[PDB]
Enzyme design. Structure first.
Site, short mmCIF file in Angstrom:
data_model
loop_
_atom_site.label_atom_id
_atom_site.label_comp_id
_atom_site.label_asym_id
_atom_site.label_seq_id
_atom_site.Cartn_x
_atom_site.Cartn_y
_atom_site.Cartn_z
CG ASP A 179 -1.90 0.95 1.48
OD1 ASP A 179 -3.06 1.37 0.12
OD2 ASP A 179 -1.92 1.67 1.70
CD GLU B 184 -2.38 1.55 -4.09
OE1 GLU B 184 -2.19 1.78 -3.10
OE2 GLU B 184 -3.76 1.52 -4.24
O1 LIG Z 1 -8.05 3.58 6.48
C1 LIG Z 1 -8.97 4.45 6.41
C2 LIG Z 1 -8.79 4.42 4.58
O2 LIG Z 1 -8.96 3.00 4.34
C3 LIG Z 1 -8.98 3.34 2.43
O3 LIG Z 1 -7.55 4.09 2.15
C4 LIG Z 1 -6.97 2.66 1.32
C5 LIG Z 1 -7.31 2.61 -0.27
O4 LIG Z 1 -8.01 1.33 -0.14
C6 LIG Z 1 -5.36 2.20 -0.41
O5 LIG Z 1 -5.23 1.28 -1.87
C7 LIG Z 1 -4.63 3.07 -0.66
O6 LIG Z 1 -5.13 4.26 -1.71
O7 LIG Z 1 -4.24 3.43 0.87
C8 LIG Z 1 -5.49 3.54 1.75
C9 LIG Z 1 -4.98 2.89 2.75
O8 LIG Z 1 -3.12 3.89 3.33
C10 LIG Z 1 -10.24 4.73 1.44
O9 LIG Z 1 -9.83 4.41 0.32
C11 LIG Z 1 -9.99 5.63 3.12
O10 LIG Z 1 -10.82 6.72 2.41
C12 LIG Z 1 -10.07 5.18 4.36
O11 LIG Z 1 -9.94 6.47 5.40
O1 LIG Z 2 -5.05 7.40 -1.37
C1 LIG Z 2 -4.98 8.04 -2.39
C2 LIG Z 2 -5.27 7.87 -3.52
O2 LIG Z 2 -4.75 6.69 -4.39
C3 LIG Z 2 -5.49 6.13 -5.49
O3 LIG Z 2 -4.33 7.07 -6.11
C4 LIG Z 2 -4.26 6.59 -7.19
C5 LIG Z 2 -4.71 7.22 -8.91
O4 LIG Z 2 -5.16 5.57 -8.90
C6 LIG Z 2 -3.61 7.07 -10.05
O5 LIG Z 2 -4.17 7.02 -10.80
C7 LIG Z 2 -2.36 8.66 -9.50
O6 LIG Z 2 -3.64 9.27 -10.16
O7 LIG Z 2 -2.52 8.65 -8.22
C8 LIG Z 2 -3.56 8.78 -7.42
C9 LIG Z 2 -2.66 8.96 -5.80
O8 LIG Z 2 -2.49 9.98 -6.19
C10 LIG Z 2 -6.61 5.69 -5.45
O9 LIG Z 2 -7.10 5.00 -6.64
C11 LIG Z 2 -7.09 7.08 -4.45
O10 LIG Z 2 -8.98 5.86 -4.73
C12 LIG Z 2 -7.00 7.43 -3.63
O11 LIG Z 2 -7.97 8.53 -3.47
#
Ligand SMILES: OC[C@H]1O[C@H](O[C@H]2[C@H](O)[C@@H](O)[C@@H](O)O[C@@H]2CO)[C@H](O)[C@@H](O)[C@@H]1O
Ligand SMILES: OC[C@H]1O[C@H](O[C@H]2[C@H](O)[C@@H](O)[C@@H](O)O[C@@H]2CO)[C@H](O)[C@@H](O)[C@@H]1O
Ligand SMILES: OC[C@H]1O[C@H](O[C@H]2[C@H](O)[C@@H](O)[C@@H](O)O[C@@H]2CO)[C@H](O)[C@@H](O)[C@@H]1O
Ligand SMILES: [Ca+2]
Ligand SMILES: [Ca+2]
Ligand SMILES: [Cl-]
Ligand SMILES: [Cl-]
Length: 646
Positions: free
Chosen positions: A342, A371
């Site tokens: 993550d 990621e």
């Molecule tokens: O810890 C609560 C948090 O969970 C989710 O965020 C994740 C997400 O699914 C990951 O793939 C990545 O983007 O980072 C996060 C964990 O570091 C929810 O999207 C978010 O709303 C929520 O606060």
């Molecule tokens: O946890 C933050 C954010 O992570 C991902 O967003 C990415 C996105 O997928 C990429 O295409 C690019 O734009 O960078 C983003 C992170 O800055 C999750 O898809 C998103 O839901 C989440 O908030």
């Protein structure tokens, strides 16, 4: 929260925990942080260089009063030590330190067993938690990362639907039950998953996450959380065991899960969240060595690049040590076959490369994916383990979001179309993912040096499901037309170079009723709906067929970029299609050449085929009206695969 006291500066020779100089002091290199139990005695070691005093606090019950409070001896390189000359089996313990004027009590950061809700460390002979035959546990073979087929699954989603036919619903052991039946007798659970032909199950957080997410003492009440809120990094999550009050139970049952998956030909990938902790003020790191384990800006406030409140300071040597030993513990103790990092862009390049090196000495077939998004933090840009620095991270895979958006449309503007749904100008985006994200040629290049660095996907736990995104971006379309777009997208993932990744339920067009971010939505939103599965057995068979097609053709699974640049050729194709060939027995393919058409054009087309020999239909025959001499006549949205036999 209350007060954080960063220490009496005279305990550490006038050097503050925030000073760059501090990283060169107390560089403890031993292998024994935490507690080592035996009937004869138990030995504790804690790293707490800024504390002036340190105690081991013993409890007889997970909620009782302290039965004993024993001073620790100041030891080498910032550590404290103690030997208790009693049989400590069945006891619980914490550390109490004095940092500055503060007394703080905390779970062992190296805890391997805990009580309910993880607020005390539990003393346990962990060999007593091994299932029968654990020493003989053998891994299914894995010749290349491109041979993996990943299935992303949440332990509660898997079984909690009321018609799942699984007894231990929502539990680790639910995924060990064989011969479980759903509505109309369909296979569910493990038998459904092995039936698919996937090779790796990637489990959402199975480490112990915070009580704020799921309260392990109120599992009689509704509950659900993805679990991205880490509390104890080296212990399993309590709510997934049959008895969160029994420290051995979650450990033995996770092992029974991994053992059974291995027996049935599946490997396990662990979703792992070393970029942040659930609460930066209350975590044991901050109670025991405040200011060291998390990242601070210049004005002494938390760096918050994660948007979770804090960042773990992976680049500081003792934290780097902690993360690596954490990884190694899950490998050694639980036999894990891979890790999905993550927000890997929050971890430094040195740490990630050192993780890759240490795992390679054990078993290079252990996967490392992540990621690698580009995100701001106090960690300098050239040190972040993201896509811009992919060329310094050999062997580490990253989710290819350019591919994801090109195929299914933008994930943040819900209504916008992508390639599958009839948008304009996405063909080159798809082509870049077909090539495994490498520098293929011309404008066809992304971040990857080698195809093992690119994870292809069109759905995961986050954002809308593939089906739900298609519905929001195709207001004119019928359910028939949408299922064809859905199927096309799955087919693109499974016939692109790199590593295919599938979301659990994508095989039956999983929906969340349009919910975009379901991390704490109820089970009705989040469960694997085995009723929908029973109604979608044709779609399930299609996905199983796609997976078997990839397994039959090494040309889809090339290991190196040189092979792709030499065997992959893009053919002239009209708008809203992509056509390519994989020529000359690519990667040991049985056939001489392969031809692949991704057709998002709903009408009839007459296509020129390269003159490479007598083509014949191998997949997608339902879209092929004829195959002549040399031309292909097609109708319909979907993938067509042809081959020239040897
Ligand atoms: O810890 C609560 C948090 O969970 C989710 O965020 C994740 C997400 O699914 C990951 O793939 C990545 O983007 O980072 C996060 C964990 O570091 C929810 O999207 C978010 O709303 C929520 O606060
Ligand atoms: O946890 C933050 C954010 O992570 C991902 O967003 C990415 C996105 O997928 C990429 O295409 C690019 O734009 O960078 C983003 C992170 O800055 C999750 O898809 C998103 O839901 C989440 O908030
Ligand atoms: O590999 C066999 C076959 O796979 C697909 O056919 C599926 C079909 O699409 C499903 O709806 C259901 O009928 O099961 C079939 C066999 O799995 C492809 O559509 C087809 O081209 C291919 O030959
Ligand atoms: Ca927990
Ligand atoms: Ca490797
Ligand atoms: Cl539960
Ligand atoms: Cl960046």
């Amino acid at each position: 929260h209350g007060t954080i006291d960063y220490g009496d500066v005279t305990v550490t020779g006038g050097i503050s925990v925030f000073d760059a100089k501090f990283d060169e002091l107390y560089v403890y290199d031993g292998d024994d942080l935490g507690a080592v139990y035996a009937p004869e005695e138990t030995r504790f070691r804690l790293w707490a260089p800024t504390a002036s005093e340190a105690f081991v606090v013993l409890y007889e019950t997970e909620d009782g009063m302290p039965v004993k409070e024993l001073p620790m001896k100041r030891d080498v390189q910032g550590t404290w030590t103690l030997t208790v000359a009693e049989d400590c089996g069945g006891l619980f313990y914490t550390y109490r330190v004095k940092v500055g004027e503060q007394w703080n009590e905390a779970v062992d950061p190296y805890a391997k067993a805990v009580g309910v809700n993880g607020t005390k460390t539990a003393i346990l002979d962990l060999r007593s938690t091994n299932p029968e035959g654990w020493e003989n546990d053998q891994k299914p073979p894995l010749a290349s990362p491109t041979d993996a087929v990943i299935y992303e699954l949440h332990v509660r989603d898997l079984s909690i639907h009321p018609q799942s036919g699984i007894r231990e619903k929502g539990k680790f052991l639910g995924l060990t039950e064989e011969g479980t039946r759903g509505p109309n007798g369909i296979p569910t659970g493990l038998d459904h998953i092995t039936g698919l032909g996937v090779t790796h199950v990637q489990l959402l957080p199975i480490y112990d996450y915070s009580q704020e997410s799921v309260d392990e003492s109120r599992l009689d009440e509704p509950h659900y959380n993805w679990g991205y809120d880490p509390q104890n990094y080296n212990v399993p999550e309590g709510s997934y065991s049959t008895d969160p009050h029994n420290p051995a139970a979650r450990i033995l049952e996770l092992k029974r899960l991994i053992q059974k998956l291995h027996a049935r030909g599946l490997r396990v990938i662990m979703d792992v969240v070393y970029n942040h902790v659930y609460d930066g003020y209350l975590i044991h790191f901050t109670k025991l060595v405040p200011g060291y384990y998390l990242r601070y800006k210049a004005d002494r406030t938390f760096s918050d690049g994660t948007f979770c409140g804090n960042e773990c300071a992976s680049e500081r040597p003792i934290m780097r040590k902690y993360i690596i030993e954490s990884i190694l513990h899950w490998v050694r103790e639980y036999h894990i076959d891979g890790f999905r990092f993550d927000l890997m862009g929050m971890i430094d390049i040195e740490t990630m490369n050192e993780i890759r090196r240490r795992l390679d000495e054990i078993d290079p077939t252990i996967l490392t994916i992540g990621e690698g998004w580009m995100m701001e933090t106090v960690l300098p840009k050239e040190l972040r383990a993201n896509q811009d620095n992919a060329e310094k991270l050999p062997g580490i895979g990253m989710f290819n979001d350019g591919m994801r958006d090109a195929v299914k449309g933008d994930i943040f503007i819900f209504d916008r179309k992508g390639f599958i749904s009839g948008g304009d100008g996405f063909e080159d985006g798809v082509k870049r993912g077909v090539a495994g994200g490498i520098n293929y040629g011309g404008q066809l290049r992304q971040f990857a040096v080698e195809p093992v660095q690119s994870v292809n996907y069109v759905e995961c736990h986050a954002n809308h499901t593939l089906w739900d995104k298609i519905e929001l971006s195709t207001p004119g379309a019928s359910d028939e037309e949408r299922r064809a777009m859905h199927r096309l997208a799955s087919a693109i993932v499974l016939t692109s170079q790199g590593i295919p990744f599938l979301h659990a339920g994508q095989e039956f067009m999983r929906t969340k009723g349009g919910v975009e971010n379901s991390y704490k939505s109820p089970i009705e939103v989040n469960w694997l709906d085995w009723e929908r599965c029973a109604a979608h057995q044709d779609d399930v068979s299609y996905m199983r067929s796609l997976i078997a097609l990839r397994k039959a053709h090494p040309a889809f699974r090339l290991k190196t970029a040189d092979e792709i640049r030499a065997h992959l050729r893009f053919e002239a194709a009209p708008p809203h299609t992509v056509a390519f060939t994989l020529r000359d027995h690519a990667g040991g393919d049985p056939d001489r050449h392969l031809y692949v058409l991704y057709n998002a054009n709903p009408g009839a087309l007459s296509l020129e085929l390269p003159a490479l020999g007598p083509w014949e239909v191998r997949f997608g025959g339902e879209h092929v009206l004829a195959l002549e001499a040399a031309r292909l006549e097609v109708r319909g949205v979907g993938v067509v695969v042809l081959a020239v036999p040897r």
